[PDB]
Symmetry: D2
C-alpha cells in the first residue's frame, strides 16, 4: 500500500527530502545545496528556479535510491525557510525577480517609513511582528516598486505572490493550487493573527494588490496532489505545510504551553508554545503562530537569530579556514579559550532581541598572539551567546527559566558547542538522536491529514535524548564571559549608513 | 515536441543534457556517485546510486530550465560500456553491485580461456580479446559467486545487464529489457557477425540465455517513460549507444576511415571501418559502431583505461591539486618532468598491451623532482598512451591521420592538447563542444522520431575551436617516446597470480 | 680594512650587513627570534636570543663572503627603539626578559602618572608623551616587580639598557656601558634639552642613576670587539642610533624639513626639524635625530605600532598566506574590501591616538566577505594610519609634503605602495635600497673612523627605483578614509582599566 | 674549562653541540644549508655555506648559553663523509663546489676502473667498492673538469680536502691541512693496511700527491683556534671522525661484533671487526673505525643513501607533509600501503647493490591509493633497506645480531622503530640522547686533552630509553620483504650508460 510519508525540507542553503515509515523512521535522505547571491553587501537573493530544481531533484533522489514507488507514498509534507519572498507571472509561471531571502536587508529604508508613520504598535499588536527587513511585507513592495508596471498587472491578478511553501506547491500542482499556511502567513507581516486573515491596513499601507495573495489554510490538510510519474493514475496528495521553525517545534512535540526548543540551522530559532493564548512581548521577541496538537492554531513566542551555522559555513567557504564544518570543533578544542577575542556575526544585521539591520559583523580583542583557532572558537562561542541572549528575553516575558533546553538542528552535532552552550546558560541541554525534527514535523503534520498516524501519542515515544549536557563552569566565569559579548555586541551596532 | 534529452551515465558521474532542434545545449546537470574499491584492482559501483543519480539529474535539468515533460520529443541513452548488472527480475534488486569495466577480478577466469585455446574464437567472433574488461567473465563471476543463482537465472528469475539495459528497465518499470549492438558487442557474449548471442560463448562461460536482454538497433523507439507532469504524458526512449560509439557518431564519423579520440575517465580511440569488420593484428579491438542511419557499422578501437581519471587521482587521493584544470596550471610551472615517468596502470594495461597484471608506477625520481613534474607527467601518460594506440591503429587500418579529432572532458587542457600534437607530430582538432557523447545519443534518439531528418542536417553544426600543430622535431618526439616504452615494460606484471 | 659592518637589531629578527667603501652591500645575514606574549597585550623577548642571533649573523656575513675580521674598519649599530633590559653587571644575567616597546603592561603606571599631573613635564622634557611605549615605566615595572632589585640597583649591582646598550656591553665583555642620544631620547628618563638624565623623572619613577649608562654621540668610537681571526685583531664600534633615526640619516634627510616613512614591524614617519626642537600639538613626538655629522638635531615623529607585523600575523598566525608577497597576490585578487576595515591595534593605538586600551578589530563583515577582502584590508590599514600621521605631521610641521620618501621591507609592495599614494593624494618615492636603516648606522660608524669623509660622497647612491602617483579621486579618498576613522573610534578603549 | 664542543657538519644542516663533564648536552645549534642539483643525479654543496653555517652555529650555541672561549676545554669535529673539496691554497677559494657523496656524476669514471681490472685491487687495498660515492672519482672529476687544475695542484697551488680537512684549515687560517683515519679511509685514495696514500690509486686517478693533507689519528690535538673573546684564548682541536664512526664510537661500540644503525639523511650500519679487517664477499664496505682509545680499528659497513632524506622530500618537494614529524601521523592512518612500495634510489643504489644507475620509483598504484599509503611506504623502505644490509652483514660477519642499537633523529619515529623491529623480527634498542654523532666527536676531542681519561668513565652514561619487539608472523614479514625485493629489482639500471 501506502507505507511511507515524505517531507520536503526547503532550507536556506540546501533543499532536502526525507522518507519515513509508520514507525516514523527515516528510510532515506537526499540533499542538494543551492547558491547564495549577494549582489550588494547586505543583500541575499536565491534563484526560485534553483529552489525548485533542487527540491524536485532531491525528491526523486530519495525515492529512486530507495527503490520506492509513487504508490507507497501516503502523502507529501512540506517545511520551508521562513520568509523568503517570490513573485511570478501567473501565465509564464515565471518569476519577475529573484527570491528575496529572509536575511536581506534591502528594505531597511522602507521599514523606516513604517516607523516614522507610527505603525509599530499596530503591527506589533496585529502581527506579533516587529518592523525589520526580516519580513515578507517590505520585500513584496520592493519587487513591486522595482518592477515597472508590476502593480497594475498585480491588481489585474497577473502576478502572484508567494512564500517558499506557496511556490513549491504551485509548481508542484501545475499551477492548480495557490495556497499557504498559518505559520507561514504570520511571517509575511500582511496577515492578522487574531483575525486570521489578511490585514487591510497592512495591504493598504504597503500598497499591495490583494489579487496576489495565496489562500491561508490549516497546517495539516489536503490541498492538492502531485503527479511524479511512475505508473500512471498515481497522484500524491500534498497535505501538510509549516514554516520550518514551527515544524521543528511540532516535530519536538512541543505542543503544549510553556514548551520550547532550540534550533540551530543557518540561524538559530527558539520558540515557546504559548498555548491557545498569544503573549505580547516586552523583551524584544516575536509573537507568532504555531501548531496545536492537532494542526490547529496555537501561539508562540519566538526568538530569531540570523547567524548560527552560516557563520561556520563562512569560515569554511569564505574564509577557507576549516576544511570540514566539523573541523570547527577540531580547531576550537585546540585552545582553552579565545584569548579574549569576540566575533559578532551580524552579517545580516542583528535581528534579536536587538533588531538592528544596520549592524555588520565584527571581530574584537585582537592581539598579536591571537590565532585562527581563537577566531574559530570565538565564532562558535558566538552562537551560544546569542542563544542566552534570547533565552533571557524569554524568561523575562514568560516568568519561567527552562530546566533544560531542548535543542535540535545540524550544528547540534558539535559537542563543543553543546557543551559550551550548557556552560554559558548554566542549563542542561538535551540532544536527541534525530536532529532533523523539522522534516519530522512536516511529515507528522502531513500524516495526520490522511490517516498515517491518528494522533500525536502514536509518536510520543519515538523521540529520545541521545545526550544531556550539564554546565561545568563557574557562574562568575559564565557571567564575565557574557559581559564582554554584550560589550562587543554594541560595538557591532549601527555600522551601516542610513542617509 | 521541442526538445531532446540525452542521458549520459559516466563511470564517474551521471549527466543529463537538453538540446533543442538546432542542436543547442540548453541545459545540463551532472551528478557524482561513489567508486568502490572492494580490493585493490577491483571496481564496483552501486546500480542503485547509478539509478538515483541519473534519475535525479534528468529531473533537475528540466525542472531547471522550466521544461515540461510534455515538451520532450525523445530521450537518448549513452553509458559506460562494460559494466555488468545482475538483478532479480521480480523485485528489481541487484544480486551484487555493478562490477565496472575496470575491475580486474576476472583475471583468473581469463587465464582458463586462454589455455582452452578460446582465444581465436573470442577474437574471431566477438572481435574482443580475453580480458577482464568485458562483461562476459563478470556475469559468470557473479554467477559463480552467487550461490544458487544459475538456477533462478536458468528458470529466469534474474536479468543480466549493462547500464543502458539497467537504465531502460528501471525507466519502463520493468516493461522493456533491451540492449543495442554497440553495447551487446562489449559483453563477449555476442557474435559481431551473426549479430546475436554466441552459443559457444554462452556455453563456454556457462550463462543461461534466459537472462540476456533483447538486442536492437541503436536508433529506434523502444518504449516510453513516465516522469510525471501533464498526465498521459509519457516519453519515448528512442536512442541507445555505448559512449565511445555514441561519441564517434556525435562527431559524424559515419564514414569508413573517420576517427576520434575521446578523453574521458579513460581514453577511447575509434575508427569507422565501414561495412567491413577489419581484423586487428596489432592489439586493437574490432567493434560495432553506427552508420549514418544508426545501422550497424564496425570499428577499430584502442582502449586506454586511465586518462582523466589520473587527474582525479591526483586531486582527490593524492590531494596534490585544487582542481583538475589546476593541473594545467602546475604542469606548466615546469618545462619537463625531470626524467620522471608515470604509468597510469591503476587497472591493468589495456590496449595494446592487455596486461591486467600491470599496476601504476612512477619512475626516474631524483632528489629534486617535485609535484609539478609529477603532475606534468600524469598529463604526459595521457599523450603517450594515445600515441601507442594510434600507432597500432594506422598499422591495422592502413590509414594515416592527417589530424586527430578529439573530444571529452580533458580536451580543455591546452597543455595536454599541445603536448598531444607534439608527441604525435599531427595536428589536433578540438571542437567547440567537447561533449560530443550526449549529442550522439541525442542525434540517435532524434533520428528515431523525426526530430531531425538526417545527418546532413547537423553537419554545419560542427565547429573547430582549435587546431593544435606540432612544435617539435622527431628527435624530441621519439626520445620522449623512448623513455615512455621503457617505463611500460617496467610497469607490467606487477601483481601476481601464478 | 676595506669594509664597514652595520648591526641591525629589529623587533623580529637580528640582521647584519657588509658594505664596501662604495656603499654597496656585499652580503647579509638574518636570524629570526621569538616573540613572547606572556599575556594578551604583553610582549617580550629573550635578551640572550637577541644577543645570540646578533652574533652569529655577524659571524655569518663575514664567513660567507670570505671576508676577514681584519678587513673590517668598523661596526655600525642600530636597533629597535625602546625595548628594555636590565641585567646583573655581575654575571651579565638579565633579571627579566626584554620588555618590548609594543608591550602594554605599564598602563597602570602610566595612569598614575597622568593622575599625578606629569603630562606637561614629559611632553616638555622628553617631548615624549605618556604611554607604555617608553622604557621609563618598563624599568620601574621590573624594579617593582623584581624583589630587592632597587637595592642592588643603587649598590651598582644591576645595569639598565636599551638594546644597543645591551649589545655593546656583551661585545666589550662588559667593558663599555654606553648609549647614544637618539636612543636616550626614548627612555622618557632623559631630558632632550639639558641633554642628560632627568632627576625629576628619575625621581618620579624611582630609578637609581647608578644603573644608567653614559649618553654619547651617534658617530663616535665607543670601543672595540674581538671576533677571533689573526690575533691582536680588534674591531671598533663607532656608530649608534635608533633604527628610525638611523633610517632617517641613511636617507640623508639631514636638513630640517626632511621626512621619510619607514615600513617595518610598525611605521615611522620622521621629519627633521634641525636644531629646532618643535613642540607637538597634533599627537606626535619630538625626538633627537642626527645632523650630517652625528651631531644632535631634532625631529617630529609619527609612530605606528603595527604595519609589517600585521602582515606577519596573517602568515604565521592566521595562516591566510604562505608567502608575505602572496599578500599582494591576494589583495589584488579583489578590487576593494567589500566594505571591510581592519584596525591593527594589536598592541594598543599609537600615534596620534595614544590608546593603550585599544585592541585589534575587524569590521563590516557580510557573508560575501572572503579572505582576500581581509588581506587587502590589512594592507589598507597600513596605508590609512599613515595618512593620519602625515596629517598631524603637516599640522605640527606647517609644511606640506609634495612627495614621500619611503623605505623598509614592506615597500617592495607595489600594491601597498600604490594604494598609499592614492590615498594620500601625494607622490611616493621609492628607493633602490630599503635597507636604509643599515646604511644609516654604517655611515655613522664610517664617518667616526674616517672610512668616509663627508655625506656628499654618499649622496649619488640615492636612486629612486620608482614613484607612485595617486590614482583615486579626491572624493573616493575622503570616503574611504572616513570609513577608517569610524572603525577606529570603535576599536578605542576596548580594554578594561 | 667546563665544556666541550662538537661540531657536526651533516649533509643538510650543520649543528654545534655543548656538553660538560657529565657529557650533558647543554645547548645546540642547527643551520640548514642549500642542496644543489645542477642535474638529476648530482649533488653539490657550497664550501662557503657549509663554512658559514658551521661557524654561526658554533658561535650561536655559545653566545646563547653565555659561555666564553675560556670555558672550552676543546672542539671535536664530525662530518659528512665523502664530499670533496678542492681549493686554491693561496686564496682559500675553491675551484669548484663540494661534490657531495650522493652525487653520481663519476659513474663513467667508475666504468673505466672496472673495465681496467681494478675491483680487486681497490677492494683489497681500500676496503671499498668502485662507486661514485667515494672521493677518489670526484677529484679527478674536478681536476679534469677545469682547464688547468692538474698542473697547479702539482706545483703546490691547490689543496684537496674533505669536510673535516676543509674546516680545520679555515678554522686555522691555513695553518693545519689535516685529516683522520676514518676520513682518509673513504677516499678510496688511501691504503687501509698500509695506513697511507695508495700510490697506484693516485697514479691511476692521476692525482698529485702534493694536494693531499696529512692523515692523523682520530683523537689528537691537531691545533688551535681563535674565536675571539677575551684576549689570548685559543681553542684546541683534538678529535675527528666521520659522523658514522663517530656514531659507532659515540655509541660505545668499542669491541668487535659491536654494531649500530644510524638513521639520518642516509642510513649506515656499522660493525666493529675489532683489530682485523674482514673482507666483504657480500657487498659491504670494509672500513676504518676507532678503538676504545681513538686508535685504528676495523669495521664493516652497510651504506644506505636515502632515509631521512626521503622524508625531507615528501615535505618540501612533494609538499605532502606539514612537518617532517607529521609522517608518523599520516603513516599511522592506514594499516598498510595497499600494495605500494617506494624504492628511494634518488641517488642510485648503495649497499648492497651499488647501482649508480638506479633512480627512485613507486610500484603498485591503484585507484584507491592515497598519499598516506605513499608516506607509509616511504618509511617502510627505510626499514627494508636496513634488512638488506643487516643480512649481508651477518653473512659477512658470521654474526647473528640479537638487537639493533640504533640512533639518529628518525629514531624518534615509533612507527619506524616497531616496524623496523617487525621486519627484522628483531628487538630494537633506542637510546636516550639521539645526538650520538656529536657525543662521539666530543669524547674523542675530550679524550685527546684529558677532559676524560677513558671510556669507562662513560660506560654508564648511555641509556636505552626504549626497546622494540617484533609482533609479526614470519610468513607475512617474509611476505612483505618479498614485495620489496621485486620493487628494488625493478628500479635497477634505470639510467643510461653512454
Amino acid at each position: 500500500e501506502k507505507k511511507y510519508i515524505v517531507a520536503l525540507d526547503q532550507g536556506t542553503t540546501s533543499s532536502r527530502a526525507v522518507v519515513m515509515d509508520h514507525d516514523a523512521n527515516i528510510i532515506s535522505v537526499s540533499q542538494r545545496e543551492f547558491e547564495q547571491i549577494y549582489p550588494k553587501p547586505g543583500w541575499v537573493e536565491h534563484d526560485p528556479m534553483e529552489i525548485w530544481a533542487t527540491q524536485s531533484s532531491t525528491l526523486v533522489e530519495v525515492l529512486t535510491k530507495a527503490d520506492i514507488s509513487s504508490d507507497q507514498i501516503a502523502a507529501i509534507g512540506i517545511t520551508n525557510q521562513r520568509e523568503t519572498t517570490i513573485v511570478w507571472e501567473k501565465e509564464t509561471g515565471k518569476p519577475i525577480y529573484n527570491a528575496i531571502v529572509w536575511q536581506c536587508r534591502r528594505t531597511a529604508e522602507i521599514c523606516e517609513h513604517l516607523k516614522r508613520d507610527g505603525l509599530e504598535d499596530y503591527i506589533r499588536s496585529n502581527t506579533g511582528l516587529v518592523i525589520d527587513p526580516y519580513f515578507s511585507g517590505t520585500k513584496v513592495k520592493w519587487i513591486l516598486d522595482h518592477v515597472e508596471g508590476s502593480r497594475e498587472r498585480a491588481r489585474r491578478g497577473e502576478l502572484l505572490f508567494g512564500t517558499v511553501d506557496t511556490w513549491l506547491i504551485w509548481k508542484m500542482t501545475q499551477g492548480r493550487v495557490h495556497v499557504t499556511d498559518y505559520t507561514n502567513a504570520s511571517r509575511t507581516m500582511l496577515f492578522n493573527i487574531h483575525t486570521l486573515d489578511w490585514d487591510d491596513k497592512m495591504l493598504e499601507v504597503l500598497d499591495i494588490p490583494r489579487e496576489m495573495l495565496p489562500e491561508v489554510r490549516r497546517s495539516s490538510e489536503v490541498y492538492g496532489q502531485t503527479n511524479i510519474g511512475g505508473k500512471g493514475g498515481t497522484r500524491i496528495p500534498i497535505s501538510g505545510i509549516a514554516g520550518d521553525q514551527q515544524a521543528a517545534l511540532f516535530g519536538q512535540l512541543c505542543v503544549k504551553e510553556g514548551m520550547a526548543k532550540n534550533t540551530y540551522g543557518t540561524g538559530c530559532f527558539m520558540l515557546m508554545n504559548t498555548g491557545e493564548k498569544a503573549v505580547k512581548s516586552e523583551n524584544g521577541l516575536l509573537t507568532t503562530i504555531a501548531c496545536g496538537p492537532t494542526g490547529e492554531v496555537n501561539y508562540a513566542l519566538e526568538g530569531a537569530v540570523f547567524m548560527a551555522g552560516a557563520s561556520i559555513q563562512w569560515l569554511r567557504d569564505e574564509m577557507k579556514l576549516i576544511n570540514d564544518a566539523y573541523d570547527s570543533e577540531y580547531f576550537a578544542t585546540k585552545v582553552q579559550n579565545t584569548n579574549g577575542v569576540y566575533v559578532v556575526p551580524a552579517f545580516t544585521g542583528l535581528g534579536a532581541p536587538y533588531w538592528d539591520p544596520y549592524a555588520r559583523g565584527a571581530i574584537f580583542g585582537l592581539t598579536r598572539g591571537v590565532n585562527a583557532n581563537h577566531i574559530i572558537r570565538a565564532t562558535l562561542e558566538s552562537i551560544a551567546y546569542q542563544t542566552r541572549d534570547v533565552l533571557e528575553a524569554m524568561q523575562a516575558d514568560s516568568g519561567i527559566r527552562l530546566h533544560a533546553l531542548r535543542v535540535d538542528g545540524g550544528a547540534v552535532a558539535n559537542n563543543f558547542l553543546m557543551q559550551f552552550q550548557s556552560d554559558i546558560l548554566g542549563t542542561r541541554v538535551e540532544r536527541p538522536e534525530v536532529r532533523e525534527v523539522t522534516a519530522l514535523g512536516a511529515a507528522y503534520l502531513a500524516g495526520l491529514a490522511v490517516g498515517f498516524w491518528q494522533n500525536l501519542d502514536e509518536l510520543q515515544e519515538k523521540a529520545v535524548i541521545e545526550r544531556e549536557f550539564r554546565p561545568g563552569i563557574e557562574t562568575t566565569e559564565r557571567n564575565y564571559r557574557y559581559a564582554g559579548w554584550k560589550k562587543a555586541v554594541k560595538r557591532a551596532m549601527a555600522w551601516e549608513e542610513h542617509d
